[PDB]
């Protein structure tokens, strides 16, 4: 009964996607900018009586997801970007996940 | 210089996908069957002199990825399935990741 939607237009989604640019000199991304891009684009709710549902994923959850995928993240949150990688957003009222695939211009 | 390909036809890929069916009574999936489905479909290599590259993700890596996405996995590897979720396969010669989105018939 928890579903995700695109903020800009209100359409329900069951997968997500992001286009990002890495730093032009170091070719790095920061974990906190990936999470903020995701939460600027997607949100969650419960349908009717209907209400917003909190997205529980925080910056250390995302750091741990990436670390277990073989990606190395330094103490500042920076990591060398891949052309393609993914992570899950979680929401809890009833739990639900939104898989997000990221493409990086590098 | 590491790339992934579909085993059945040899086409290079930069994202992956899987269709799975959960257990008809419990609605559960096991982590080890998800990983075996992924490795039956996708592999990695380095292009020329060319050679196969090992996929390093094992069953405890995948368990830790899912746990950090809010999904609960019991000591036997079983978890209640979502309609949509994702994980990353890693390969190391030069590192590379393949994001895989799973859809579940439930």
Automatic annotation (TrEMBL), chains A, B:
Record domain S-layer protein: where: 9-106
Source species, domain of life: Bacteria
Name used for this protein in its record: S-layer
Species this chain originates from: Lactobacillus amylovorus (strain GRL 1112)
Lineage, opening ranks: Bacteria, Bacillati, Bacillota, Bacilli, Lactobacillales
Whole-protein residues included: 213 to 326 of 456
């Amino acid at each position: 009964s928890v579903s995700f939607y695109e903020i800009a237009n209100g359409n329900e989604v069951h997968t997500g996607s992001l286009n990002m640019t890495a730093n032009p000199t170091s070719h790095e991304l920061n974990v906190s900018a990936v999470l903020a891009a995701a939460k600027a684009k997607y949100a969650a709710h419960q349908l009717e009586n209907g209400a917003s549902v909190a997205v529980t994923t925080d910056v250390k959850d995302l750091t741990d997801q990436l670390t277990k995928a073989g990606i190395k993240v330094d103490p500042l949150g920076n990591f060398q970007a891949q052309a393609s990688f993914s992570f899950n957003l979680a929401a809890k009222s009833a739990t639900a996940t939104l898989p997000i695939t990221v493409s990086v211009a590098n």
